[PDB]
Amino acid sequence: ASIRERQTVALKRMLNFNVPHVKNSPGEPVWKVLIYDRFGQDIISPLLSVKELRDMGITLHLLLHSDRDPIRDVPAVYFVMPTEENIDRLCQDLRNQLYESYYLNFISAISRSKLEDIANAALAANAVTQVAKVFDQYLN
């Protein structure tokens, strides 16, 4: 479907988004982390798997509602829903500095109010973050 396609559009982008990262081992791919939620998995899985996740160059993929590992030396991605709870996880992971980067990706149409929370959620620790486009804003 043309719709389901747009879903992967953002994904394939974030899952490959090579952002300004430091290179320690010359001659090594770009390891990127990902953090998905109930919806995030509801979209990433249908168009991605565990073996494909690591096969694309993922350093770690876990649920915001789980024990996140400390990988400040590797860029991270947060493809989740901008829900009240999620917004709290953003400021929770942003302050912990679990990952160097935080390529955010909202499933629904977040608002300036909720957005400011995540935007500032990082400002608290000054973590490099970037809110990507949404796909489920029309479906899912």
CATH number of the domain where residue 82 is located? 3.40.50.2060
d(CA 116, CA 110): 10
SS3 of residue 14 by DSSP: helix
Strand extents, DSSP E, the chain: 32-36, 58-63, 77-80, 101-106, 128-132
SS3 of residue 135 by DSSP: coil
For strands 32-36 and 58-63, give the pairing.
parallel
d(CA 117, CA 136): 21
140 found inside a domain = no
Cα torsion 61, 64, 66, 70: sign: positive
29 found inside a domain = yes
Nearest CA to 81 among 64, 68, 98?
64
* 80 and 105 Cβ atoms separated by less than 8 Å: yes
The tokens of 47 are what? 């168009």
Listed in sequence order, the residues at least 6 apart from 11 whose beta carbon sits closer than 8 Å to its beta carbon are 43, 44, 47, 48, 79, 105, 135
138 found inside a domain = no
d(CA 48, CA 10): 13
Q: Tell me which residue has tokens 């390529």.
A: 103
Cα torsion 33, 98, 128, 115: sign: positive
d(CA 103, CA 126): 14
* 54 and 42 Cβ atoms separated by less than 8 Å: no
Give the count of domains, the chain.
1
Residue numbers of the domain that contains 68:
1-133
105 found inside a domain = yes
d(CA 112, CA 109): 10
**Experimental technique of record:** NMR
